[PDB]
């Protein structure tokens, strides 16, 4: 995996590659790692596919039940439900999740949850095996309050490099845009992002 | 007959007489009130001085839940404490899982479901208290009142205990004369007056006034007790109105 | 609380009787008569079905006689549903014993186990007793052919000939009169049917109102055969004995 | 809390009666009439869809239920008690049989399992008996076609034909005159419709009558082809139209 | 084992080989790897053969009870969700690797499940020891908007690649076609490209060749009357 | 006479505690109505705020169970909320286990089974409520399924609940006897709500303001309640023709 | 413990068991009786892990004695052996299994036949004319295969047993301090005090 | 009447009779007095004997170095409640290195007694307690009733004829509260208070029981010749 | 150490024209030590035959277990269990011990009493059914048995011809396995007669 979430002026965008691995064999070259736990609260999955799918399904169940009783949950609340599962089952899980969401009050927010189960609220976050190769690039190129087009370019260029160097990453670059306007899915194919 | 001997038994009317008998214990208790103001809530209660040997200001009746919710009740005091203890557990588990402090409507249902559960079986007795509670959350101020049956609604003003009719009448005047709203400091003054006026039903023994409040501007949305100069100012305002 | 509604099924009367056991026995006295007769060369089990209908499918019906294993069978008097609960427990106990010792369960050990289960419902648990009386007909290599009975109290006793259900007083007198020790199976078959014919509350005793079974060493050489009689076979034995 | 009713609510009275079972049978007597008739090549079960309101959609309320592909059930008495028994009966057919032997249970054994559930509600702590009497029709390879009645006590009896509920006494007399051992399935359906008309007051048509059969295998209802040994369910619920067609030749 | 699943115009097809092995030995030459969860939901299994059938029948049983409870025809996502949650609970110890396919009122579906309960969605999938040989064929010849006839051809061609090139797979090709608004057709032994040639010699023995010590009649009948 | 205190049979084969739970149902003195359109299902209910000290926004007997399912209750609010919380939990669990949204009729059955258990098990009392579930099901379309203390449930073309249910029931019966169809032949939900309110006015014989009613609407993929101002717009359209 | 032998002759069963008990470095005792009487006509010898052997043997003994009192009847050797097997077969999948091998010698009073059953710690039962556990069979079975006849007398069985013990004393590295020999027949169980 | 068979049943006027009957057991019990100043807190308890051969039943129980109570009613119930207090005082010291506040100790006793008044099968406690203690906010006196009601007071009395001692304390309120730094005079006031509840019998050497706790005074009980000084 | 090859032994089953055959060796051992030459591995419950190889204690335990279950089956069903049904019962019973299994290799053989169709089936230790038309093999010389059966077998053999085929398959396989032999038994099964034959073989 190479995954990232970036806040910008109008909200937040999640980004991911599409490669799933069992060794050197690419078990799925068109995987969807950007997952929906609520209308405008999504997550990026890295680590064990089984673990992150089981966790995401449980979180979706918790937030659906939260919504029926207390109305729309915050992104912070969603991150806390993720954390509770990851921390309390740290011995039996291998999951690195980035939580991203859009409120109207709080706007775009990003929370990263590494292996231990700790929570870290950040302006942007990167994770997965391929993220190691773009710490330098992302730190130099990230600005706060970017536009939608700038943020898409930042994520596209960043994951392009991650894919280029990390054998575990590859395929298409999926993205999900979260703003007041709604939810937009984007896809970018190899012929596009490789020539960058 | 015999329908009133056991809890959770429907009478031929469709009534639970045991719950209705629990209300009698509430009506027997001291007067307590709640006032919803512009950016918060005010709670007040009548404390009967049974003897000179009672230490003033020490036997505190109003209780805090979490850091943003106040609870006051009339009837069997121990039952009220048991309910608040549950409320504190409910609020603790909510904040544990969801991070944010429990919203007041969410909290209201937690108590409601718990009180309602004690009308479902004959192995438990219904609660002998009506509880007035509320506070400030992300969506603003809320005031609730919860009965032995488990029934609760939101309120602009609320009152329960022996002097509830007197209090209710005074609260209804405030609602009519202030459609735009009441300030937090005004509500503290008005709360003092209403308890003093409601003390005519308990006129044999003298009493001690106790007030608390949550306000976005005055207390940063946290529950606090009214003390010292602000308490004395409210007592003076109250004493002036009865004369 | 709940105490208010408790019947207290497991208590003594001032006279030292178990209310529920006594009342369960009263229920069994209205059930169809079942008779067991033990002979030197086998055992007979006869039982009367209760006021049947012409539209009842008899050949696939079983309310009185049940097989516990290849060597042991029972005649039921009381609540059929209650009896089936106990019967399945007894069938399992027989198989447990066979698995453990690699030998067929002795008749008395099976009877004691069921009777102990009935006893438990009279001493603890606060539940109603089983409204069932059994007649056990069985064979083992220790005591040979054996007849027993158990009732809701959990007490069991051995018999040469016995009846349970309705009109046991009249039935036991008739058996006591005509029974002899050197009797044979064919004679016992006739006695069982003659007794039912006289004690029955029905106008006449016909094949469709009966269930019949024999346990014989009339199996080719040293072994035992259980025969649950078919409707046509009951009709034939009724003509043979001269009742119809 | 805790269930503190660990004692029997059904007990023997001085006369030897089990009051609660008798009273449950009384509830069955008040219930709507249902019947069953066995033929040489099938079994039919039928009942009236007594609609509580004309605004209610009576198709959504199923009085005749499939238990297994070859077994069906109908009742008289308390509908809710029936509904939960059908849920329990369907599950027990899998847990205590199909998951063990890899095949559906025979009619008599499934009936035995339902009976056991009804017996336990007659003896267990803090419960009342079920207020229903069931009629269960079914087919299996070694026993052929069969029809069973199950009462609140847990007792069950096999029948050639029978009726339960409101007008059962009159209906059973009607069936005794018409039933013989040479009936074809169509003849049994015809007799079922004639019998049921006597106990119905108002409208008598495909929309107010619920009727199912246990007959030939229906490969068209199997849902798949390719396995010769799987030939489809013998249970089939007759449509509203199929009933009305047989009411013209009535 | 080689198993594949291929989406097409109006439905989905799954296929499998028919060889089951105990190490290097062929236990059964005509094994049935296409299992039925419900009439129009079928799945193919690889890995531990007992686990793939056990887990299929358990979920299939619960799916049937669910269908009766809800008065609705079963959905593939129901079978998928029940399978993955079961497999995740057992943390991979139940060695079931499944390709789940079917049609329901929502439409046609194709999923794969791994033993740890990880799932994925696709238009073409392969699992088992011959999955790489099969996937090579699928990656070479798959296109969008395949017809029913094209999908059956592609699926069986992918299984053949497994049969011939993977030692874990062999013998025959089984196919199951699930089309929308139609009965699912189970095509057992759709291809038979591995019939054994006639032997050079008959090995029928002369009667009395085997030395015998004792003969006796075995009593299979019950205890007799009279 | 303890056969009237717990849920066991009387000599007549009756369960008196169940019958008395039905009587508790009308303790609130509120009437509700539900009807189906082409693309929607509408439910309306009387709203009564007798005390001036009450916050009228918190007084409600309509619940949002899931995104698709809505529930109106006839009975005391404690039992109503008890049922609501449970239905919400059941709907959520269903989605998690079986991978699709719980249908309206299946939820109704599940809550009805839970109600049946209270009529058989002695330690649990029945809830004194009648639950009317509404949705636009993806398979069955517009749906109305109603549950009662006896554990009985059934689908409905339309239905009414409360003290004056019979008057509303007959009014609706007569309309469907004319039109000879199982629904309100109308495109927009706005007009289906107008039909519902109009026919309640005719049956009860009372006029309504914006604060006297409470409305819930089910469409494909969402159920929602109308605000006082959304209802006012509805009342204005009724008066202008 | 070490060596336990058994032989079934015409009208009796003979069990031979070593007397030594060794705690690693030293021989703590040289007169130990590795057997328990389960019923008047049924004897069980045993060998396996320390402690478990006696604990098991006495547990079986208590259960058979309980059965005898309850029914006022002696179980057949076959019935006893099946009970013992089930207990060991139950034991092998326990948290901590009984590490005990046994021989059951009994005289069936119904069939008037001696019977010898060999059961290992796994619950593996076989009826035999002669049997052993551990390495005892490796030395003795070639002699028993040669000399054994089904119609042997008790005295002939003891002589064949002496030849077996002599071979053990010659070729086994361990000093097992001789054997206690017991005979099971129609009259019950007795010990041969000179061997 | 019909509503006093168990603790789970309200009467038509909203009363809990089993709780009221438990309250009655306290009135039958022997008198005990509690009073405090700003520095010290005192318990005085009239012990009761069975006859002349018997000992005098002990009335005062120590809970910690800084806390203890006197009882009136069922003594075994006082042992159960005092044991619970000992544990709670102890949990506070072991876990939080903190002496348990007297007010918080009252809250714990209230909640323990409440659970016995709302559940089927159980029964209310049949004893009344007077808890004294010295913590971080000075001296304290508490009165516990088995209904659950706990009250903080300057002085009080419970048991038979307790009304006489309570009236005396109500008069003396202004005097005894000022008795700071003088333990002997505060006990004198307690002994004079309990004397207003005596009839026929007087305070003897094995009759009287006194306990005290204060600023630099651990909770200590005085019996026998140690109280002859105050007779 | 390996539980499935401590005691040793083999079972083989075949189909013929209107008949089935099942056969087994008689050896029980403790690894190298031969302990018993009378340990039969084929049992029968009514007309359904079951052979079991593997760990001997489990062989005995399972026989007792299926006798238990088929006896209760017969009492309730009022008929003898059929091979197809019994096969499913074996599979269920083995899989319930998925993570603590009986170390065995069962083989079912019999003729359906109603259809008259010959039936055979095999299982792994964990329950997986192998239902072959031709033959089933099991035990420590399963490889050897696969080699014999694959060449010697032809379809539709008459009962007396089938006897010679299965006997020669077992004998020659057993002689190439250290832990099999010490005698052999062959069952020939027809719709209403079953013949049991003990074979003479080398005793090493
Ligand atoms: Cl349910
Ligand atoms: Mg790459
Ligand atoms: Mg109840
Ligand atoms: Mg050799």
UniProtKB/Swiss-Prot annotation, chain B:
UniProt keyword list: Acetylation, Cytoplasm, Nucleus, Proteasome
An annotated GO BP: proteasomal ubiquitin-independent protein catabolic process
GO molecular function term, any single one: mRNA binding
Source organism superkingdom: Eukaryota
Post-translational modification note: The alpha and beta forms are probably products of the same gene with different post-translational modifications.
Protein location: Cytoplasm; Nucleus
Transmembrane spans: none
Any one cellular-component term (Gene Ontology): proteasome storage granule
Subunit-structure text: The 26S proteasome consists of a 20S proteasome core and two 19S regulatory subunits. The 20S proteasome core is composed of 28 subunits that are arranged in four stacked rings, resulting in a barrel-shaped structure. The two end rings are each formed by seven alpha subunits, and the two central rings are each formed by seven beta subunits. The catalytic chamber with the active sites is on the inside of the barrel.
Note: Present with 12000 molecules/cell in log phase SD medium.
Main function: The proteasome degrades poly-ubiquitinated proteins in the cytoplasm and in the nucleus. It is essential for the regulated turnover of proteins and for the removal of misfolded proteins. The proteasome is a multicatalytic proteinase complex that is characterized by its ability to cleave peptides with Arg, Phe, Tyr, Leu, and Glu adjacent to the leaving group at neutral or slightly basic pH. It has an ATP-dependent proteolytic activity.
Family: Belongs to the peptidase T1A family.
Curated annotation (Swiss-Prot), chain C:
Pfam families according to UniProt: Proteasome, Proteasome_A_N
Location in chain, cross-link Glycyl lysine isopeptide (Lys-Gly) (interchain with G-Cter in ubiquitin): 99, 198, 230
GO biological process, one term: proteasomal ubiquitin-independent protein catabolic process
Gene Ontology CC: cytosol; nucleus; proteasome complex; proteasome core complex, alpha-subunit complex; proteasome storage granule
This protein's record includes keyword Kinase: no
Subcellular location: Cytoplasm; Nucleus
Domain of life: Eukaryota
Entries under PROSITE patterns matching the protein: PROTEASOME_ALPHA_1, PROTEASOME_ALPHA_2
Gene3D superfamilies to which the protein is assigned, alphabetical: Glutamine Phosphoribosylpyrophosphate, subunit 1, domain 1
Keywords: Cytoplasm, Isopeptide bond, Nucleus, Proteasome, Ubl conjugation
Main subcellular location of this protein, as a coarse class: cytoplasm
Keyword Ubl conjugation carried by entry: yes
Alphabetical list of InterPro entries matching this protein: Ntn_hydrolases_N, Proteasome_alpha, Proteasome_alpha-type, Proteasome_asu_N, Proteasome_bsu_CS, Proteasome_sua/b
Function: The proteasome degrades poly-ubiquitinated proteins in the cytoplasm and in the nucleus. It is essential for the regulated turnover of proteins and for the removal of misfolded proteins. The proteasome is a multicatalytic proteinase complex that is characterized by its ability to cleave peptides with Arg, Phe, Tyr, Leu, and Glu adjacent to the leaving group at neutral or slightly basic pH. It has an ATP-dependent proteolytic activity.
Note: Present with 17100 molecules/cell in log phase SD medium.
Family membership noted in the UniProt record: Belongs to the peptidase T1A family.
Name of protein: Proteasome subunit alpha type-3
Organism (species): Saccharomyces cerevisiae (strain ATCC 204508 / S288c)
From Swiss-Prot, chain F:
GO biological process, one term: proteasome-mediated ubiquitin-dependent protein catabolic process
Family: Belongs to the peptidase T1A family.
Coiled coil region boundaries: none
Note, other: Present with 15200 molecules/cell in log phase SD medium.
Top-level taxonomic group: Eukaryota
Cross-link (Glycyl lysine isopeptide (Lys-Gly) (interchain with G-Cter in ubiquitin)): 222
Subcellular location(s) of the protein: Cytoplasm; Nucleus
Gene3D superfamilies (alphabetical): Glutamine Phosphoribosylpyrophosphate, subunit 1, domain 1
Gene it is expressed from: SCL1
Keywords per UniProt: Acetylation, Cytoplasm, Isopeptide bond, Nucleus, Phosphoprotein, Proteasome, Ubl conjugation
Protein name listed in UniProt: Proteasome subunit alpha type-1
UniProtKB/Swiss-Prot annotation, chain I:
Position(s), cross-link Glycyl lysine isopeptide (Lys-Gly) (interchain with G-Cter in ubiquitin): 69
UniProt record, GO biological process: proteasomal ubiquitin-independent protein catabolic process; proteasome-mediated ubiquitin-dependent protein catabolic process
Residue list for modification Phosphoserine: 30
Disulfide bonds: none
PROSITE patterns reported for this sequence: PROTEASOME_BETA_1, PROTEASOME_BETA_2
CDD domains, A to Z: proteasome_beta_type_3 (cd03759)
Pfam families: Proteasome
Any one GO molecular-function label of the UniProt entry: endopeptidase activator activity
Major localisation: cytoplasm
Lipid metabolism listed as a keyword: no
Key words of the record: Cytoplasm, Isopeptide bond, Nucleus, Phosphoprotein, Proteasome, Ubl conjugation
Protein localization: Cytoplasm; Nucleus
GO CC terms of this entry: cytosol; nucleus; proteasome complex; proteasome core complex, beta-subunit complex
Record family assignment: Belongs to the peptidase T1B family.
Subunit relationships: The 26S proteasome consists of a 20S proteasome core and two 19S regulatory subunits. The 20S proteasome core is composed of 28 subunits that are arranged in four stacked rings, resulting in a barrel-shaped structure. The two end rings are each formed by seven alpha subunits, and the two central rings are each formed by seven beta subunits. The catalytic chamber with the active sites is on the inside of the barrel.
Protein name as annotated: Proteasome subunit beta type-3
């Amino acid at each position: 995996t190479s995954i990232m979430a970036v806040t910008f002026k109008d909200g937040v965008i999640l980004g991911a590659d599409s490669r799933t691995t069992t060794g050197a064999y690419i078990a799925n070259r068109v995987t969807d790692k950007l997952t929906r736990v609520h209308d405008k609260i999504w997550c990026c999955r890295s680590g064990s596919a089984a673990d992150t799918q089981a966790i995401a399904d449980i979180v979706q169940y918790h937030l659906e039940l939260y919504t029926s009783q207390y109305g729309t949950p915050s992104t912070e609340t969603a991150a806390s439900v993720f954390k509770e599962l990851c921390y309390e089952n740290k011995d039996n899980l291998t999951a690195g999740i980035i939580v991203a969401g859009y409120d109207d009050k709080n706007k775009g927010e990003v929370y990263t949850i590494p292996l231990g189960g700790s929570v870290h609220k950040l302006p942007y976050a990167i994770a997965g095996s391929g993220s190691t190769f773009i710490y330098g690039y992302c730190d130099k190129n990230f600005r706060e309050n970017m536009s939608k087009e700038e943020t898409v370019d930042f994520i596209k260029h960043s994951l392009s490099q991650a894919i280029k160097w990390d054998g575990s990453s590859g395929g298409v670059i999926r993205m999900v845009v979260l703003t007041a306007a709604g939810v937009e899915r984007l896809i970018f194919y190899p012929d596009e992002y490789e020539q960058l | 007959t015999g329908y009133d001997l056991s809890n959770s038994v429907f009478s031929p009317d469709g009534r639970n007489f045991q719950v209705e008998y629990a209300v009698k214990a509430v009506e027997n208790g001291t007067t307590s009130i709640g006032i919803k103001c512009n950016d918060g809530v005010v709670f007040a209660v009548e404390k009967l001085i049974t003897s000179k040997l009672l230490v003033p200001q020490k036997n505190v009746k109003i209780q805090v839940v979490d850091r943003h919710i106040g609870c006051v009740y009339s009837g069997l005091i121990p039952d009220g404490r048991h309910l608040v203890n549950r409320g504190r557990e409910e609020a603790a588990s909510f904040k544990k899982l969801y991070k944010t402090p429990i919203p007041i409507p969410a909290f209201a249902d937690r108590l409601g479901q718990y009180v309602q559960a004690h009308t479902l079986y004959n192995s438990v007795r219904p609660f002998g208290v009506s509880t007035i509670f509320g506070g400030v959350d992300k969506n603003g101020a809320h005031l609730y009142m919860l009965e032995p049956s488990g029934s609760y609604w939101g309120y602009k003003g609320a009152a329960t205990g022996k002097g509830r009719q007197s209090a209710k009448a005074e609260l209804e005047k405030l609602v009519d004369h202030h459609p735009e709203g009441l300030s937090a400091r005004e509500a503290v003054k008005q709360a003092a007056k209403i308890i003093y006026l409601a003390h005519e039903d308990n006129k044999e023994k003298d009493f001690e006034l106790e007030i608390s409040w949550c306000s976005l501007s005055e207390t940063n949305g946290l529950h606090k007790f009214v003390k010292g100069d602000l308490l004395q100012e409210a007592i003076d305002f109250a004493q002036k109105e009865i004369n | 609380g709940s105490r208010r509604y408790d019947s207290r099924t497991t208590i003594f009367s001032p006279e030292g009787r178990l209310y529920q056991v006594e009342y369960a026995l009263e229920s069994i006295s209205h059930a169809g008569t079942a008779i067991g007769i033990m002979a030197s060369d086998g055992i007979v089990l006869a039982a009367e079905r209760k006021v049947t209908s012409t539209l009842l499918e008899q050949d696939t019906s079983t309310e009185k006689l049940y097989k516990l294993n290849d060597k042991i069978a029972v005649a039921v008097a009381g609540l059929t549903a209650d009896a089936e609960i106990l019967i399945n427990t007894a069938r399992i106990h027989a198989q447990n014993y066979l698995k453990t010792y690699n030998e067929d369960i002795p008749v008395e050990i099976l009877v004691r186990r069921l009777s102990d289960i009935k006893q438990g419902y009279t001493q603890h648990g606060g539940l109603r007793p089983f409204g069932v009386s059994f007649i056990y007909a069985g064979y083992d290599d220790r005591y040979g052919y054996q007849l027993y009975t158990s009732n809701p109290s959990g007490n069991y006793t051995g018999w040469k000939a016995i009846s349970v259900g309705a009109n046991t007083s009249a039935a036991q007198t008739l058996l006591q009169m005509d029974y002899k020790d050197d009797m044979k199976v064919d004679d016992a078959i006739e006695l069982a049917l003659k007794t039912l014919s006289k004690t029955t509350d029905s106008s006449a005793l016909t094949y469709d109102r009966l269930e019949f079974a024999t346990i014989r060493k009339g199996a080719n050489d040293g072994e035992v055969y259980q025969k649950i009689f078919k409707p046509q076979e009951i009709k034939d034995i009724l003509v043979k004995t001269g009742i119809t | 809390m805790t269930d503190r009713y660990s004692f029997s609510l059904t007990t023997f009275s001085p006369s030897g009666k089990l009051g609660q079972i008798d009273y449950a049978l009384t509830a069955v007597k008040q219930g709507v009439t249902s019947l069953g008739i066995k033929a040489t090549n099938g079994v039919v079960i039928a009942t009236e869809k007594k609609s509580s309101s004309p605004l209610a959609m009576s198709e959504t309320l199923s009085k005749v239920s499939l238990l297994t592909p070859d077994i069906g059930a109908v009742y008289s008495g308390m509908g809710p008690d029936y509904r939960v028994l059908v849920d329990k009966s369907r599950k027990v057919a899998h847990t205590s049989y199909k998951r063990i032997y890899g095949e559906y249970p025979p009619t008599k054994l499934l009936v035995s399992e339902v009976a056991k559930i009804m017996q336990e509600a007659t003896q267990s702590g803090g419960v009342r008996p079920f207020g229903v009497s069931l009629l269960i029709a079914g087919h299996d390879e070694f026993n052929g076609f069969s029809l069973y009645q199950v009462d609140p006590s847990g007792s069950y009896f096999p029948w050639k034909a029978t009726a339960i509920g409101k007008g059962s006494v009159a209906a059973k007399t009607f069936l005794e005159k018409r039933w013989n051992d040479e009936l074809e399935l169509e003849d049994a359906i015809h007799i079922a419709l004639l019998t049921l008309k006597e106990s119905v007051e108002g409208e008598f048509n495909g929309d107010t009558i619920e009727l199912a059969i246990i007959g030939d295998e229906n490969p068209d209802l199997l849902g798949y082809t390719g396995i010769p040994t799987d030939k489809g369910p013998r249970f089939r619920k007759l449509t509203s139209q199929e009933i009305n067609d047989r009411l013209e030749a009535l | 084992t080689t198993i594949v699943g291929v989406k097409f115009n109006n439905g989905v097809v799954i296929a499998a080989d028919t060889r089951s092995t105990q190490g290097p030995i062929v236990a059964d030459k005509n094994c049935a790897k296409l299992h039925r969860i419900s009439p129009k939901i079928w799945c193919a299994g690889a890995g531990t053969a007992a686990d793939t059938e056990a887990v299929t029948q358990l979920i299939g049983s619960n799916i049937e009870l669910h269908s009766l409870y809800t008065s609705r025809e079963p959905r593939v996502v129901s079978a998928l969700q029940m399978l993955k949650q079961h497999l995740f609970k057992y943390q991979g110890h139940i060695g079931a690797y499944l390709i789940v396919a079917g049609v329901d009122p929502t439409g046609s579906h194709l999923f794969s499940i791994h033993a740890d309960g990880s799932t994925d969605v696709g238009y073409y999938l392969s699992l088992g020891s011959g999955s790489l040989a099969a996937m090579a064929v699928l990656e070479s010849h798959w296109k969008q908007d395949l017809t029913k006839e094209e999908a059956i051809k592609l699926a069986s061609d992918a299984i053949q690649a497994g049969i011939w090139n993977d030692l874990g797979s062999g013998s025959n090709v089984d196919v199951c076609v699930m089309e929308i608004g139609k009965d699912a057709e189970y095509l057992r032994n759709y291809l038979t490209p591995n019939v054994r040639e006639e032997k050079q010699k008959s090995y029928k023995f002369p009667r009395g060749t085997t030395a015998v010590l004792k003969e006796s009649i075995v009593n299979i009948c019950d205890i007799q009357e009279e | 006479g303890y056969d009237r205190h717990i849920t066991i049979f009387s000599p007549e084969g009756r369960l008196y505690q169940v019958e008395y739970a039905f009587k508790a149902t009308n303790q609130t003195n509120i009437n509700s109505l539900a009807v189906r359109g082409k693309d929607c299902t509408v439910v309306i209910s009387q709203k009564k705020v007798p005390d001036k000290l009450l916050d009228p926004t918190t007084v409600s007997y309509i619940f949002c169970i899931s995104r698709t399912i809505g529930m109106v209750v006839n009975g005391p609010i404690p039992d109503a909320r008890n049922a609501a919380l449970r239905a919400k939990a059941e709907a959520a669990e269903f989605r998690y286990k079986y991978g699709y949204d719980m249908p309206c009729d299946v939820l109704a059955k599940r809550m009805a089974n839970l109600s049946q258990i209270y009529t058989q098990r002695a330690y649990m009392r029945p809830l004194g409520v009648i639950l009317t579930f509404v949705s636009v099901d993806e398979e069955l379309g517009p749906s109305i399924y109603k549950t009662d203390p006896a554990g009985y449930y059934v689908g409905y073309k339309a239905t009414a609940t409360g003290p004056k249910q019979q008057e509303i029931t007959t009014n609706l019966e007569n309309h469907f006897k004319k039109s000879k169809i199982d629904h309100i032949n109308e495109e927009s939900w706005e007009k289906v709500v107008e039909f519902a309110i109009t026919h309640m006015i005719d049956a009860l014989g009372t006029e309504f303001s914006k604060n006297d009613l409470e409305v819930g609407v089910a469409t494909k993929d969402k159920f929602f309640t109308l605000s006082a101002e959304n209802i006012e717009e509805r009342l204005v359209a009724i008066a202008e023709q | 413990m070490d060596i336990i032998l058994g032989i079934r002759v015409q009208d009796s069963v003979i069990l031979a068991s070593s007397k030594a008990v060794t705690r690693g470095i030293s021989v703590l005792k040289d007169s130990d009786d590795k057997t328990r009487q389960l019923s008047p006509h049924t004897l069980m010898s045993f060998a396996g892990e320390a402690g478990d052997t006696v604990q098991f043997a006495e547990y079986i003994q208590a259960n058979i004695q309980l059965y005898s009192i309850r029914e006022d009847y002696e179980l057949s050797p076959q019935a006893v052996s099946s009970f013992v097997r089930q207990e060991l077969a139950k034991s092998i999948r326990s948290r901590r299994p009984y590490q005990v091998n046994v021989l059951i010698g009994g005289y069936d009073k119904k069939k008037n036949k001696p019977e010898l059953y060999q059961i290992d710690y796994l619950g593996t039962k076989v009826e035999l004319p002669y049997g052993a556990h551990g390495y005892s069979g490796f030395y003795t079975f070639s002699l028993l295969d040669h000399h054994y006849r089904p119609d042997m007398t008790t005295e002939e069985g003891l002589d064949l047993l002496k030849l077996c013990v002599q071979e053990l004393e010659k070729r086994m590295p361990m000093d097992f301090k001789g054997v206690i020999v017991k005979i099971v027949d129609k009259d019950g169980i007795r010990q041969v005090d000179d061997f | 009447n019909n509503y006093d068979g168990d603790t789970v049943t309200f009467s038509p006027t909203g009363r809990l009779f089993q709780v009221e009957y438990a309250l009655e057991a306290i009135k039958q019990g022997s008198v005990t007095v509690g009073l405090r100043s700003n520095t010290h807190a005192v318990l005085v308890a009239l012990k009761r004997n069975a006859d002349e051969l018997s000992s005098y039943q002990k009335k005062i129980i120590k809970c910690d170095e800084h806390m203890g109570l006197s009882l009136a009613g069922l003594a075994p119930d006082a042992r159960v409640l005092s044991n619970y207090l000992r544990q709670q005082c102890n949990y506070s010291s072991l876990v939080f290195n903190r002496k348990l506040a007297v007010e918080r100790a009252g809250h714990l006793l209230c909640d323990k007694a409440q659970k016995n008044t709302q559940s089927y099968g159980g029964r209310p406690y049949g004893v009344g307690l007077l808890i004294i203690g010295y913590d971080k906010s000075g001296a304290h006196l508490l009165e516990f009733q088995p209904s659950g009601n706990v009250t903080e007071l300057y002085g009080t009395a419970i048991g038979a004829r307790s009304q006489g001692a309570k009236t005396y304390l109500e008069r003396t309120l202004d005097t005894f509260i000022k008795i700071d730094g003088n333990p002997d005079e505060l006990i004198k006031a307690g002994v004079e208070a309990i004397s207003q509840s005596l009839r026929d019998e007087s305070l003897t050497v094995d009759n009287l029981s006194i306990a005290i706790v204060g600023k630099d005074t651990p909770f200590t009980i005085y019996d026998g010749e140690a109280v002859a000084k105050y007779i | 150490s390996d539980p499935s090859s401590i005691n040793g032994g083999i079972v083989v089953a075949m189909t013929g024209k209107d008949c089935v055959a099942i056969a087994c060796d008689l050896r029980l051992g403790s690894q190298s030590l031969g302990v018993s030459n009378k340990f039969e591995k084929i049992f029968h419950y009514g007309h359904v035959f079951l052979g079991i190889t593997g760990l001997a204690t489990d062989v005995t335990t399972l026989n007792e277990m299926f006798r238990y279950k088929t006896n209760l089956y017969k009492l309730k069903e009022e008929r003898a269990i059929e091979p197809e049904t019994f096969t499913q019962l074996v599979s269920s019973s083995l899989y319930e011990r998925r993570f603590g299994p009986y170390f065995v290799g069962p083989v079912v053989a019999g003729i359906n009493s109603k259809s008259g169709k010959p039936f055979i089936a095999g299982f792994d230790l964990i329950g997986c059914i192998d239902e072959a038309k031709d033959f089933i093999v099991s035990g420590t010389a399963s490889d050897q048995l696969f080699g014999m059966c694959e060449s010697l077998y032809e379809p539709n053999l008459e009962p007396e011809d089938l006897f010679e085929t299965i006997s020669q398959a077992l004998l020659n396989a057993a002689d190439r396995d250290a832990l099999s032999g010490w005698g052999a038994v062959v069952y020939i099964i027809k719709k209403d007669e079953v013949v049991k034959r003990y074979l003479k073989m080398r005793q090493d």
